[model samples]
Target chain A: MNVESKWLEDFLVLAKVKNFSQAAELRNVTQPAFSRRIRLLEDTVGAELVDRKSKPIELTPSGKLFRITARTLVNQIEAGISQISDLSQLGGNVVQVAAAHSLATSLIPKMQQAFDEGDYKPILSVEAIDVDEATKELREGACDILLAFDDDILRLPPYQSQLIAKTELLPVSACDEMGKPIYDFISQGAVPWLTYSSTSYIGRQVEIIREQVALTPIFSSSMTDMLKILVLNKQGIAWLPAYSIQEELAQKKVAIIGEQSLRLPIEYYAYRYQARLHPAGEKVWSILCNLD
Target chain B: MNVESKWLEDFLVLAKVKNFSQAAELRNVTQPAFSRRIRLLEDTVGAELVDRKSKPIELTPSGKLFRITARTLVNQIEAGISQISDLSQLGGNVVQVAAAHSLATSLIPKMQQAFDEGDYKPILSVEAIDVDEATKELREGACDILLAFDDDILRLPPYQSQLIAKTELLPVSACDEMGKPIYDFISQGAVPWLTYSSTSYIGRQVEIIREQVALTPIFSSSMTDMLKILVLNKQGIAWLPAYSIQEELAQKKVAIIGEQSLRLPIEYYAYRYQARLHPAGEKVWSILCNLD
Candidate 1:
């Protein structure tokens, strides 16, 4: 009846680590003492919650049951405390903002720093996410506002958008030690085209893949940064955001492939719903709107 | 705007597996084709969903946001489909019951077989859960009637219980290779005690830990079957359900450690609340009621 939350915490930690010494050290206790504490907890519940005889300890069905309960209880308590804290600063002490990777990397840092130095100085719980998560976060109130890439087809209704910024998606390839094309598609047979998949926000690049360039895709990803890494590693050529890699392009670590002709001009957009938002979000929204 | 559920499913699978080839294989598609499907999905949403090219592929912020949405949608659809199907055969063809691990392993097999041979020939969606989950499942309509262990401490409101079975908590230890007690608690000082935690539902074994015998607690777990394995392996001593290990007791894999007198009597009780129950449950409930 008096099972404390810590017992469940210990069990949950053990579940993840699958080691007593490591779990004990993480819990900041000696292994022997931790074992005794587990014993102490078991005494209170009157049930064995673990299968300790196994090399990697396993939870019993009851342990699994209590684990879910414990997790729910712990999460609820954390959420209760955090929501209260977040609510007290409703006018903008904290901003729960979600942004596309493009804006998050290239633009949001300056925005975040600028806001921090300003009068509001709101702590931004800024989530750097992809379009899929950002859109959902904005819709579900997981975040107050979202910055996204405008692909002309994103259609989450009952929301308004602001043209925050714009960028170009251009084909890029890794430069060799000599700073030339690593693998030239025009010269190589069946080029290893690394590009965006159709599900990605910047999938307009696929059109470029189909048009003008007869390249076979070897790698495909939605994440611009990931593609950039592959580009840096000379895995293959990919179309990435112009703003995200200005330095890399300038450093000659990467270079635009082909005649700078295959470029998709895209818009960076800030969006929010018609529903009532957090006060901090309102301020940010107003600020964003006024900047236009 | 026109993104389908399959896009979300692909992202979710990638999120869990963190490997394209692995996820693709499980999803039954060529890796490139799977990647294209993801791309197709992202193009529809006009946003990136995942950060591919990481050691373990990561979901972009959009990825996480969509993950919860996708998971919820899929789970809800599955639940709806299941509930509808179960509802159609509610009279007697299918029954959803939840019970404690003890009853699940020992008692329900017989009951399930009996039901299977009868006119209803009910298909069971029986869950072997701990008291907490079983209690919640019945209360939340995830299950029909439920069985729980009663140590005079299982406190719930408005639910009535009928004693269906009783078992004794008998202290046991792994026998030597020659079938002798590995260590005797009464004769030896501070024998190693392996048992459950207080946070678990069946933590009554702790009382024996403090009673009539000095013991150095060694291993702990809530899973009786797991504990039974530990007992067989000479890890330490534990108190377990007498019925569950009759074979072990008979075969001399394990033996009673103490003076053959320490037995904690426990009751297994079947319970259902006052709320209108499942029609399929009604048949099973009637059968339980008639057993008395």
Candidate 2:
């Protein structure tokens, strides 16, 4: 018994049915070879597995002892193989897509609706975060595809990109008592400005654009939703996404900063790795690529 | 870079607290390798784990994705190691013991009483089964000690045995209308017998004894309690443990068959391996070996 996985499997079958010929039959081997395999296993362990004297081929105490470990060993190896291959394995019908938080909160549900209304029922496993992490998911096999922001269509570890939505980042300020801009960018001395925190993904882009034009730094927050809060408090003004400001703007809590606004180009895009996907993944990929 | 378990561990730590230096110090790896370890994990999985630019480092969407599996991998490994070590490892005052159902019903409570009333406070994890399965538990290290029926002092997979109680098997029959023996051996017309199933351990021994005795075997059952019911209905005579019938015998529901009874030799014994046991196990073992 130079113990192999096959032998333990044979032993499990034998343990269930205490007859050698029947156990051998189920194991797809002849009776003599099955017995020999059991004998080999017992020899390797330095113990006897069966009491040949018992009428029903009873297990010796040692044989019973080996069964627990044999089952555990087999189960663990199988589990380990599945876990390591999880990233790219789409034997499941549910599509795994990594997405950015902004799009996750806004557009991914629309994507979900698209799949659900189509001929195929969709099961989505979505993870929402920032762009850099999404890129990592694509490179590693953890997820088959991503919904993200396009810094450049061809950047490091490139994905084959398809644009789904294009929107502009708009600048706005809280309305004053007279419903005027909180601080005019033209007349402003140093109006306190609420901005994205220095380390925020959009903060640097805002920082680079504001090199000659910012009036004051009133506050900083890491998230877009939080930035909207500071602006409502009349902290100052930073560019905000139109989707995020829709309700507030409609209610007149905030107004455009001025006729002068720094409108930057932005796009909501979907992409995937250069590697071939599972057949099911390819189907979902094609469906999403059709999103305008 | 070689990915170690340390990296996965480091990543789980980072996910909880997004600060690099704090997570690094807790991991006992320098901030550089800690970041590198996280980077290595990300590299191996082809994923990024956190948003570096967020105020308090944030997980990118893929980072959230990777955290689940990294945690799963670590926790599952720990569970496997503990499961494989479960039998012999006891952190609490718990003592695990396996016993035959017959002894479990009759004698083990007395053993539990000995521990509770004496200097040692016992937390017992008991598994009661028939002898073959009990022997399997002991040999497989699921239970380091067992209360077993000793056939001989020297046995296969030898243990250090202490004889704690001696009991004998007896043949019994239901009393007739006048409370007399149901059958006279000299004048019987095929005695209707109720007995243990031949597949059972006690049944085999009973079967051997009954070979020379007269029995029609009108009923065969696995349980002594159930056999008592059959005997109460006057189905047949069967050999049952004395303790099982103590109350019934006092009530005269059944009596020893005729004036003759076969009191076969049997002992209730405590046994364990020759190898050293845990300190707690050794303490309990001492109490038993010292028992009168």
Against the unseen true structure, what C-alpha lDDT does each candidate score?
0.66, 0.66
Off by over 4 Å in 2: A1-292, B1-47, B50-91, B116-120, B130-132, B151-157, B176-178, B183-186, B258-261, B290-292
Q: Model 1, range B1-292, lDDT digits (tens) per residue?
A: 2334455567778889999898888788899988998888666545556656446776544455556755654554344333444334433345666776766788766666555355545656676765556666655445556766773543356676677766788888878668888877656567777778766655654574466777777877778888888777778788888878889889888888666557777777777763544344566666666552
Clashes of 1: 37
Model 1 segments more than 4 A misplaced = A1-292, B1-71, B78-92, B113-118, B151-156, B176-179, B208-211, B259-261, B274-280, B286-292
For candidate 2, the TM-score is 0.40
What's the residue-level lDDT of B273 in candidate 2? 65
Clashing pairs in 2: A1-A40, A129-B61, A136-B47, A140-B46, A193-A218, A199-B53
